[PDB]
Amino acid sequence: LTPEQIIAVDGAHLWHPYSSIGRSPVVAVAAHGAWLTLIRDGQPIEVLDAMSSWWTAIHGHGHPALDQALTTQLRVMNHVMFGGLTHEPAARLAKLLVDITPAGLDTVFFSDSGSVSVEVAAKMALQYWRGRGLPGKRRLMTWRGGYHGDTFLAMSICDPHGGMHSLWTDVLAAQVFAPQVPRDYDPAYSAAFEAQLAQHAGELAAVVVEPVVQGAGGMRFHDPRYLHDLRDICRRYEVLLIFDEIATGFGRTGALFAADHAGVSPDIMCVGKALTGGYLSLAATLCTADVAHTISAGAAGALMHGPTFMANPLACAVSVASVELLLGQDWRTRITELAAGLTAGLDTARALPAVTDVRVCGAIGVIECDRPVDLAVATPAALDRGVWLRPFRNLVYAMPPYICTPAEITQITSAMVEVARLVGS
Amino acid sequence: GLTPEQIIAVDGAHLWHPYSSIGREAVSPVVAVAAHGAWLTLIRDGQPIEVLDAMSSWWTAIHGHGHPALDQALTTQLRVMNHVMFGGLTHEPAARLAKLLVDITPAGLDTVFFSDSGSVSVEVAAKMALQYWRGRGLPGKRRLMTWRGGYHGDTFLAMSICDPHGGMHSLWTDVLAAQVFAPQVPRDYDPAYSAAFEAQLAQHAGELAAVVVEPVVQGAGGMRFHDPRYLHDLRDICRRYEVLLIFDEIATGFGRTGALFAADHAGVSPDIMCVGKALTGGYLSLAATLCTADVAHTISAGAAGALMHGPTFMANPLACAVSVASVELLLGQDWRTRITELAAGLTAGLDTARALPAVTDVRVCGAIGVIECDRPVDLAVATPAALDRGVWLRPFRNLVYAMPPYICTPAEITQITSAMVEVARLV
Numbered sequence: 001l002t003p004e005q006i007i008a009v010d011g012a013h014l015w016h017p018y019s020s021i022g023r024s025p026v027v028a029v030a031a032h033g034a035w036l037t038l039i040r041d042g043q044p045i046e047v048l049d050a051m052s053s054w055w056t057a058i059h060g061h062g063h064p065a066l067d068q069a070l071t072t073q074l075r076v077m078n079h080v081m082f083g084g085l086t087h088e089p090a091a092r093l094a095k096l097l098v099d100i101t102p103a104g105l106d107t108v109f110f111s112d113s114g115s116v117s118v119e120v121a122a123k124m125a126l127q128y129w130r131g132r133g134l135p136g137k138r139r140l141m142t143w144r145g146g147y148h149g150d151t152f153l154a155m156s157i158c159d160p161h162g163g164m165h166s167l168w169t170d171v172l173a174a175q176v177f178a179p180q181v182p183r184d185y186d187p188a189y190s191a192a193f194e195a196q197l198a199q200h201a202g203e204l205a206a207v208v209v210e211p212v213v214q215g216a217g218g219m220r221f222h223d224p225r226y227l228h229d230l231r232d233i234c235r236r237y238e239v240l241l242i243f244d245e246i247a248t249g250f251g252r253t254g255a256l257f258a259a260d261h262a263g264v265s266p267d268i269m270c271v272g273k274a275l276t277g278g279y280l281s282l283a284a285t286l287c288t289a290d291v292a293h294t295i296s297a298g299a300a301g302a303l304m305h306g307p308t309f310m311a312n313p314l315a316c317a318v319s320v321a322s323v324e325l326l327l328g329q330d331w332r333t334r335i336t337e338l339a340a341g342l343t344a345g346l347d348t349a350r351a352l353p354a355v356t357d358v359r360v361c362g363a364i365g366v367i368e369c370d371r372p373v374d375l376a377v378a379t380p381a382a383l384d385r386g387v388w389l390r391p392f393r394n395l396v397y398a399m400p401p402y403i404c405t406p407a408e409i410t411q412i413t414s415a416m417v418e419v420a421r422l423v424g425s
Numbered sequence: 426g427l428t429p430e431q432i433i434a435v436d437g438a439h440l441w442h443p444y445s446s447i448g449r450e451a452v453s454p455v456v457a458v459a460a461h462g463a464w465l466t467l468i469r470d471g472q473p474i475e476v477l478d479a480m481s482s483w484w485t486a487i488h489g490h491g492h493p494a495l496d497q498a499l500t501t502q503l504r505v506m507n508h509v510m511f512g513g514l515t516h517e518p519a520a521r522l523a524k525l526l527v528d529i530t531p532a533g534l535d536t537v538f539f540s541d542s543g544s545v546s547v548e549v550a551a552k553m554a555l556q557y558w559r560g561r562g563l564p565g566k567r568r569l570m571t572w573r574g575g576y577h578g579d580t581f582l583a584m585s586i587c588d589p590h591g592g593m594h595s596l597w598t599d600v601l602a603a604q605v606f607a608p609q610v611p612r613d614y615d616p617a618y619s620a621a622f623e624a625q626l627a628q629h630a631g632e633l634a635a636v637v638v639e640p641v642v643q644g645a646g647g648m649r650f651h652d653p654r655y656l657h658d659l660r661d662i663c664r665r666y667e668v669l670l671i672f673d674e675i676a677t678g679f680g681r682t683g684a685l686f687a688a689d690h691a692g693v694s695p696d697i698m699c700v701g702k703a704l705t706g707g708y709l710s711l712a713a714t715l716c717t718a719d720v721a722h723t724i725s726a727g728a729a730g731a732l733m734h735g736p737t738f739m740a741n742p743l744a745c746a747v748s749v750a751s752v753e754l755l756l757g758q759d760w761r762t763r764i765t766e767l768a769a770g771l772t773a774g775l776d777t778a779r780a781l782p783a784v785t786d787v788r789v790c791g792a793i794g795v796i797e798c799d800r801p802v803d804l805a806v807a808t809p810a811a812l813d814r815g816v817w818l819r820p821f822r823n824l825v826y827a828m829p830p831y832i833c834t835p836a837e838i839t840q841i842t843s844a845m846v847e848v849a850r851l852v
């Protein structure tokens with residue numbers, strides 16, 4: 001198919017994310033390193049993938065180590081059913097994940113998507129308390145501003161009013177919501193969180209939050225000390241603590257996992273997105289040995305979940321390579337350099353008339369605007385400057401590949417600033 | 426690098442397996458070290474042995490493992506574009522696959538929403554159904570109806586329409602959505618069943634967004650078959666009472682039942698359809714939800730607006746590329762004759778099990794063969810028996826069954842069925 005034919009087929013037959021049908025996408029034809037080749041007005045152009053393809057492509061596209069890991073595994077074994085069989089890619093990846101995640105997370109359940117890994121975490125929490133003979137502990141608690149995926153359970157802990165799933169609240173499980181967690185640390189907030197949790201403790205299976213950075217809900221940051229408070233509160237009231245690190249994992253916030261900013265270990269943890277270096281869909285839910293054993297010794301005797309492509313050897317093999325590539329370099333210095341480049345590059349946006357905030361956390365850079373960003377203006381403005389940016393809500397933001405040179409980061413931040421300037425034009 | 430012993434050690438300490446425990450699995454998993462064609466290489470007592478993948482790795486591996494055409498499609502795409510976000514961008518693999526799927530699926534399904542697994546595609550189908558009726562100003566139409574014996578995945582909405590026994594709905598009391606269940610659809614066609622289904626649906630019609638069923642073959646819920654004519658009845662009932670019809674063809678798709686899609690046995694088109702498992706030829710996780718023009722434009726014209734779903738790895742170029750190759754490989758051969766031959770081989774091979782003491786039924790539909798026994802099948806006994814005969818079988822409950830790769834030779838089908846018959850004999 002030509003780009004023209006792709007556009008025609010796409011218009012007729014393809015549903016895009018968070019969209020309606022019939023009420024235009026840009027053709028992508030190649031991706032290498034930090035760069036995409038897109039078709040604009042019939043001609044190929046090279047643009048920086050400032051979004052890392054929705055936060056996945058941390059080593060960029062077509063990395064030789066990841067490519068070879070995939071082709072090596074493809075030669076041996078593409079996939080076998082994980083029911084009754086095991087294999088080396090799953091074992092290598094599970095061993096890696098247990099060793100690099102917060103202390104105490106000793107078991108690994110692979111699934112094929114982030115939303116599913118969140119449902120698995122919830123199922124773990126619910127089955128845990130059923131195993132303890134306390135089936136009334138079945139509700140979830142979170143704070144506002146959150147996002148945890150698009151399946152119906154995950155939707156139930158999305159922000160009820162400003163969240164993308166707000167229109168569904170009347171058919172979702174009704175969960176417990178604390179107010180928006182502030183950026184700066186305020187002990188009054190933690191005290192109020194505890195007071196609210198206290199009156200629901202007997203019906204709460206778990207607290208579920210995104211640690212440090214809330215992503216799709218508004219790119220909001222909060223002080224890591226809140227996580228210390230959450231761990232304490234959950235410990236004292238016997239509520240499981242679940243961290244959704246599907247966006248924050250694998251170095252993105254400047255720590256390997258955002259939980260590490262607070263030295264906190266949850267009872268259950270979800271990871272995904274950057275897990276495979278953006279090659280293939282894979283996610284994982286980890287839990288402590290205590291949780292696993294309590295589920296396993298329960299009247300159920302088994303965690304009742306088992307995706308068809310569970311622990312897919314191809315996805316596991318590229319994930320192993322991606323994690324090893326990350327760990328085998330000085331990733332912390334790399335991220336610190338990125339963060340410094342984002343900070344320096346976005347500083348001039350603070351003075352722009354339409355800009356209300358500029359904030360950076362590791363390899364996350366955000367310009368918050370005073371109005372929703374119009375993609376019809378933003379997209380060509382960024383493409384004109386050789387950068388693929390995808391704003392949402394009132395945010396112009398970047399989550400660049402870790403392989404971006406300082407010059408490339410400067411190019412990215414320059415485009416972001418010019419998009420923000422156009423917002424107030 | 427890891428030896429098989431080190432793999433077992435890591436696995437026992439750190440890996441969850443499907444529907445299992447940590448620490449008290451009666452049987453340790455077996456180490457798989459290679460797969461090629463219809464054959465797996467497994468480690469038995471330290472020795473690598475080649476055994477037939479009689480299960481097609483849970484319905485997925487219809488062209489066998491490491492098929493050259495599929496390997497090639499994957500590596501070709503890998504060299505140009507591994508993955509880009511589907512938010513704001515599109516690409517040739519997505520377009521090629523979408524075009525293929527709309528052309529070969531039942532008439533009227535012309536829009537495709539890609540996702541990353543079967544369970545998610547079922548959730549997307551339910552969301553479509555619910556949002557559809559919201560778009561018609563009937564938000565009370567929010568429940569689902571199905572018949573017993575079904576399986577539709579493991580996420581919480583998918584669980585709510587799984588058979589209340591199979592999905593152990595006593596453990597999840599009040600947790601799951603309360604859906605409407607009709608009785609187990611029988612194997613043989615009985616118009617009384619359909620009339621009863623209709624009467625039950627009628628009393629719930631103002632509450633119901635959709636009927637969701639597996640057409641012709643109910644897989645994980647019990648490998649049960651039913652007459653295609655029931656689907657004709659469902660289509661009619663749904664039309665007259667204004668309830669959408671959703672077919673979950675995640676297990677039945679791409680030729681498995683002897684038709685390209687099981688719906689084709691009845692010549693009916695659902696409003697929404699889910700596909701998966703064999704979509705990628707068993708290389709990578711991919712699924713899709715298709716709907717009619719009416720469904721898509723009613724959702725899109727609703728005040729609610731956009732369908733708020735968007736998997737991060739939606740329409741992944743690698744998975745789409747291999748799927749295109751898998752579908753073209755299927756369509757480029759006389760697949761109908763291939764399946765008919767497989768069915769003949771299964772029927773011939775399983776015939777002798779019918780007289781076995783423990784066996785209550787033997788049934789075959791396309792490339793699916795089932796021996797139903799009168800008691801649960803012991804894995805600790807059945808697995809070495811099968812392996813001794815060069816076959817990887819995975820019984821569940823009282824069922825010894827197989828869904829072999831379409832590339833299996835007559836000799837391989839003879840080997841598989843003989844292994845099944847022997848497992849039944851040992852029961």
Ligand SMILES: *Cc1c(COP(=O)(O)O)cnc(C)c1O
Nearest residue numbers: 307308542543544577578675676
């Ligand atoms: C296997 C299956 C599913 C779920 O697919 P996963 O990829 O395991 O989530 C759903 N419906 C049917 C009919 C299936 O056979």
Ligand SMILES: *Cc1c(COP(=O)(O)O)cnc(C)c1O
Nearest residue numbers: 114115148149246247735736737
């Ligand atoms: C991306 C993401 C998920 C899962 O989304 P998918 O669309 O299923 O990949 C869940 N939680 C958070 C915090 C995420 O960023």
Ligand SMILES: NCc1nc2ccccc2s1
Nearest residue numbers: 054149216392735736737
């Ligand atoms: N479901 C995966 C994602 N969903 C979103 C939503 C808004 C911004 C980024 C993302 S990534």
